[PDB]
């Protein structure tokens, strides 16, 4: 028997345990595919597209999936290196405008009204203070869509203070494979752009004069965005004062 490596409170066989496996031999059988991952315990999902040379496998815990990926990624099968990556999460949402009293557990509890939640996290900075952002990953897409639609139409509240949660699909980006040089076409535009090597703009040159103008443009964008942040703080301060006055008004109307 193999260890599960489940972490405290971790749900089993979640989408975070799902691995994409590419560049498989066309001779790949479902039994041989299972065999490759046998050391990582029982899988709950096993899919293989023999002709397309790819498959999916779901392991019990995030740790077993990290181990399987670390150990098997790049392994040579019938002269080809295997490509193993975590499967893109199909039901992940980003949450914004969270109160600092919202914990991972409260966010999970709140979002479970929409359907089963695999995980919910309140994001904290290096100091361990709430950023106001978080994420919610559902077991399936219909609950994620329900949470997206309902939180967009209505005002979903997690606390006494009617601070509404902002819900958006989680942005997915690859910071793993990126843009390899070998897959970049050596066109004339590539050549014109790659002609000059990485360098610091030389004082007294046309490059330096223009790079200083680009620095100026970056500085104008920073100023303008900070000016919007300022307008928003003034408006938020105004809204808070108006609502405290409106709270007193609402309460004083009642017998």
């Amino acid at each position: 028997d193999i260890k599960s490596f489940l972490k405290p409170g971790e749900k089993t066989y979640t989408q975070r345990c799902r691995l994409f496996v590419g560049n498989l031999p066309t001779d790949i059988t479902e039994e041989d595919f299972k065999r490759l991952f046998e050391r990582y315990g029982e899988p709950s999902e096993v899919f293989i597209n023999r002709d397309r040379g790819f498959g999916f496998i779901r392991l019990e815990s995030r740790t077993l999936a990290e181990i399987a990926k670390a150990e098997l990624d790049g392994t040579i099968l019938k002269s080809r290196p295997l490509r193993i990556r975590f499967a893109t999460h199909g039901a992940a949402l980003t949450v914004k405008n969270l109160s600092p009293v919202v914990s991972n557990e409260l966010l999970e509890q709140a979002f479970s009204q929409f359907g089963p939640v695999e995980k919910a996290v309140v994001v904290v900075d290096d100091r361990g203070r709430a950023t106001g952002k978080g994420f919610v990953e559902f077991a399936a897409k219909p609950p994620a869509r329900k949470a997206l639609e309902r939180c967009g139409d209505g005002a979903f509240l997690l606390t006494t203070t009617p601070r509404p949660v902002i819900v958006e699909p989680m942005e997915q980006f690859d910071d793993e494979d990126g843009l390899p040089e070998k897959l970049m076409q050596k066109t004339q535009q590539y050549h014109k752009e790659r002609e000059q090597p990485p360098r610091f703009a030389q004082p007294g040159t046309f490059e330096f004069e223009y790079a200083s103008r680009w620095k100026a443009l970056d500085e104008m964008e920073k100023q303008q965005r900070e000016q919007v942040d300022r307008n928003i703080r003034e408006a938020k301060e105004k809204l808070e004062a108006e609502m405290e006055a409106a709270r007193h008004e609402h309460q004083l109307m009642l017998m």
Partner: protein, 239 residues
């Protein structure tokens, strides 16, 4: 085999007893094969240890996290890559290798990646991971003081320290500051504000302010895009 003792097998060990030693740290991780560099931040209550492989670090982390040690409950996590930088305003034709080559002038680059969106299109952002903090500090100082150009196009890149956010452990209930304001805030459960109520009005006005921020930021995007397209024209005509 893969390169061993990389930053991918480096663990953070927090809430250490004040009398912890480098040999005690090694003894704690002895079951998890050979250990490389051990570094303890004195009187801070935290330290680092490099294990040989990612498998060994994954196992040690799950098995040793929350372990009681002399009254303390240890916290074992994958260490945040300290010597990592975010690079913004990347020009076209920047490959991961060119990014590595570019930043290799400041010191030893462990890895560099050009971030691609969910459809493989470059985001204009990249990550540069150095082996040590002095090399990352050099890149930060030099790229702010000078104009660092990765390609022919004279638009310098912006290099910032990587924002280190704990999106793994986040804010557990046990760590939230408990006080009267906290209990007051938790008296109303998660719910949708009901149309007609004071809370619905307040929350809808709060959404309108969020929508105003969004509109104003989209206006700055449009102004800057226009400013950039004008500068590109002036630069091409002055060549």
């Amino acid at each position: 085999g893969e390169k061993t003792f990389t930053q991918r097998s480096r663990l953070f060990v927090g809430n250490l007893p004040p009398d912890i030693t480098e040999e005690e740290m090694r003894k704690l991780f002895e079951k998890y094969g050979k250990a490389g560099e051990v570094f303890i931040h004195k009187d801070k209550g935290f330290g680092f240890i490099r294990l040989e492989t990612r498998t060994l670090a994954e196992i040690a982390k799950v098995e040793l996290d929350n372990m009681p040690l002399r009254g303390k409950q240890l916290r074992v996590r994958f260490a945040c890559h300290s010597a990592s930088l975010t690079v913004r305003n990347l020009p076209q034709y920047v490959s991961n290798e060119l990014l590595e080559e570019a930043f290799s002038v400041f010191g030893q680059v462990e890895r560099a990646v050009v971030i691609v969106d969910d459809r493989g299109r470059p985001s204009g952002k990249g990550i540069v991971e150095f082996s040590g903090k002095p090399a990352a500090r050099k890149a930060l100082d030099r790229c702010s003081e000078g104009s660092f150009l990765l390609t022919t196009f004279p638009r310098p890149v912006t290099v910032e320290p990587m924002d280190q956010l704990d999106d793994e452990e986040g804010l557990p209930e046990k760590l939230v500051i408990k006080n009267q304001q906290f209990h007051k805030e938790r008296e109303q459960p998660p719910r949708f504000a009901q149309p007609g109520s004071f809370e619905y009005e307040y929350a809808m006005r709060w959404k309108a302010l969020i929508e105003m921020e969004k509109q104003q930021q989209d206006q700055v995007d449009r102004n800057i895009k226009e400013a950039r397209e004008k500068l590109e024209m002036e630069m091409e005509a002055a060549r």
